Amino acid sequence: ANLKQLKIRMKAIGSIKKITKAMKMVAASKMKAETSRLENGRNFAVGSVQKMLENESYVQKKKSTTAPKSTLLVPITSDKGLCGSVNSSIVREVKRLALNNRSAFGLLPVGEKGSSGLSRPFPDLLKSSIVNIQNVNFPTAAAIAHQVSTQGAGYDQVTLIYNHFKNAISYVVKHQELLPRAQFLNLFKYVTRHEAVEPELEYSKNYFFELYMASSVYNALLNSSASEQASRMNAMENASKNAGEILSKLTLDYNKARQAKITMELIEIISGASI
Amino acid sequence: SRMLDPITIGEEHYTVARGVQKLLQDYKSLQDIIAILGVDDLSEEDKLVVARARKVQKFLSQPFFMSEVFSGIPGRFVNLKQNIASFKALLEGAGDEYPESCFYMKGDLEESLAAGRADALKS
Amino acid sequence: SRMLDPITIGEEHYTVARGVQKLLQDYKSLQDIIAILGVDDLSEEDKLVVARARKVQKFLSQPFFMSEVFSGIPGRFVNLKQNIASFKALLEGAGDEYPESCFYMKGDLEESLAAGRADALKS
Amino acid sequence: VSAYIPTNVISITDGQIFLETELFYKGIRPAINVGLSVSRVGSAAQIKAMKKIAGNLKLTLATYRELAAFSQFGSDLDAKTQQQLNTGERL
Amino acid sequence: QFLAPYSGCAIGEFFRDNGKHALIIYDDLSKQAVAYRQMSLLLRRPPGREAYPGDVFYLHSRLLERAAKMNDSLGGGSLTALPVIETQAGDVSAYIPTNVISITDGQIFLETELFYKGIRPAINVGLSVSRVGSAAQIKAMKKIAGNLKLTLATYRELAAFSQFGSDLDAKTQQQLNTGERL
Amino acid sequence: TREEEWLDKRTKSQEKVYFDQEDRKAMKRLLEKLNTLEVENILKRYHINYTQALIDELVDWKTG
Amino acid sequence: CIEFAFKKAGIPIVRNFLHSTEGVIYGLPQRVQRNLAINYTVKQYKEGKAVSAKTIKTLQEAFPSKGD
Amino acid sequence: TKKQKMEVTLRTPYKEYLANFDGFSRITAKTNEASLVIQNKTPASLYVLPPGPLKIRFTSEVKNVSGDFLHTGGWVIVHADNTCEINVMDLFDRKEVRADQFEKGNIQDLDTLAGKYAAKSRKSTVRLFTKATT
């Protein structure tokens, strides 16, 4: 069946499997680095502000307990494509939570695939996004946390959607809920058990707000970045696996076509030699 | 089929026919990459083509009266008007929300919706 | 060519010849990875290889008198000295700054540089 | 087209019009593959008003076939590429 | 064209029988089989696979088998053969290549892609194999030859990741670099 | 079933997009580097912005 | 002053530490220097409306302020 | 309700130095107003430490840590359950100060209301670090 065409297509799959196999090696290499950075930076000042606020009994007495009507969603996705199904999962969940009720979410995306995938379904809803992150570090995470703070004033609540890196091969979507700046300050002024006199309360309230916001953002990026390399490696493995199965199947058809070719040509020679 | 032309048959029948052919043809042009890797990394517009193509492909199958012993389900006779209307609504995106399983071995589009809607009710 | 021997032809001519062959051969291997990842994901070393390789490949195109009716550009004659000197300069990166568009259907490297400057004043 | 009879006929005639089954079902009717079709006479037969417009038409269609792949890649599109992508779609 | 290989082979046996060492090179050996096939078809003999006669295999056997290493009794002479074969599509699955490979001890497979890359001589060490092996090499070459073969063997396996040099972890890019030196 | 064509198109497509942007930067850099008639003067006196096309017609109008 | 820098000017605490270390980044080991790096991109999201590159990180680029 | 003697946590976004430690005997740092000293039974309070020095006494020598560091800025909270946590942007030892390498291109500033405090803080830290080396 035109052996020349089959052999060319077999060559193509061979290269794909080769490059697909190589990308898995790099996926594992980078995953090691991210996990090394994650394990060292994880649980950094997380829940600290939440803990002390809970220890503040007077705060709980004067705590303003209301349901936020308008909230802001900031999904976290990877920018490089062919990273796995982690991006599809996040964009899928936010799509469900958003398509249900519209005009109640700002949907400030993070990551090329996250924003691009949510552009067409939710036009005029997402106005800005962050992409092309050179590296993950607390100074940068603070810049992102600061931007979200500026955009969080319009909404009564803020939540982050990202992948949770629980295992090298298991990444579960996890979403945190953070209150805006306005709600934080009015809640922080009630703080009386933990004295703040070295910096006065007017300064401390705004400073620890950054720590409260940047801590969650910084932690989310690490979990999502680690899930990226993890899901990417698994994707290349499945891709290289499927590439090999198809390549082997065509090899059988190539040999089968080879036998038919020799058979066809040989009969022609015999037919001409008969006469 | 030589009978397929806009002048011989109704123009609507011609458009619906090309709509399904173009849909499956585009999906067929992507089966290669879909095999190596899943459709998650696929573009949104292309994912919609793939998703809707599966719905139409499953809906094409229908049980026969003579093959009732093989499958064990009663056959179905689809009228021409129901045939055109069935695919017309499916191409528009009527039963895209329902799972592709409800269109397997169905006579009319309304029959698949009843099965697809029931599958959503039980869960 | 049987004449492609360092003893038969000048060593400089033989050197520039293999330099182009190796450049194109390397660029061909990168096509595989570029298809999935792209030129951006390549290293600075590979980027320059692909950059000069494309410019050299396009510069090989030469319009002749017999092709005027098809293309509409008058033919051109290139001498051996200008030929070897033109490619030798590209291998050293003389034209790596200008766009790859001017190194197309040109006779000599100087003609490509003049066209590059003309396009600048035009815009 | 690698068969014996088609190969010979192609070498005898001047130009050949390749018809593709994929293009036919994708709505491209007449399903003509411009990438392979060619004519020896070229612009020598076209009229003055046709040669001028025919030349630019070929170049525009050539680029569109290249950008066809990046459409699947997506995730970004330059201002000019979007124009060339759309412009080719009109042709 | 069919007798020339045997004619030259007889000239080499003279040196072999007299105890001298001789080297005979059959250039375009494949063309010989074509010349013999021509005589077979013109004689209306029953054609076989690829129109070659049934004894096309025997044609090369009786020829190459005359190149051997005589013992010290006859004089100790020898005759080394180096037949050349031209593969159309680099596929050794054809009729004649499988014959000459089954008759000869080893085959030096030359790739055209390696020549374009600048690997001159374009020798593919992957397919190239020698049955005698270290037994032929001198005591000095055996040692360094063994280690050299293993290094290249591992490099070809890791060659699939050559483009990914800095991305991969340490202890592997070094092996890639070492192979490049070899 | 043609995957070789898929890779080929992907190669040409992405390479064109990448170098197309580089062509813009290359022109801007070389242009900035290179940077560092009676009808022309009369019009400048009236501080009227003149296009190259207009200058051509006036010159042709005089010669014609 | 960390207190008045925020009161009379919209300087967040993080930006202050950056400006603080700004003059001593070279004195600190390279380990810390690689940590003090912010480089990302912000796009106002239409098909191709805007593409902003945030690299300064000390002025009104990453942490805006009233004084700027 | 209550916690044992004490627990201290010194963390940095890029590395964790002490997840929880009890051997330390006393902590002293410099705030904007004055220097404070946090030890066992210190009541609840919040603090914000500028880029100053942090000295902590160890009853038993801890490996790889000298006990004298210069931080670039951090937050401090003394929870109700007799627990203090120090979170700084970055940390290093005095021995790696590499003094005399300051003002290497970042001297230029902008004449604005924000640039004023920017230069003010930068100068304050320089005079501090120079003294910290002594």
Ligand SMILES: Nc1ncnc2c1ncn2[C@@H]1O[C@H](COP(=O)(O)OP(=O)(O)O)[C@@H](O)[C@H]1O
């Ligand atoms: N230099 C050229 N540049 C662009 N197109 C060309 C050029 N030469 C030929 N074409 C096209 O090649 C075709 C002629 O091919 P031809 O030389 O006759 O091949 P063959 O030797 O098999 O007959 C013409 O249609 C012509 O338009």
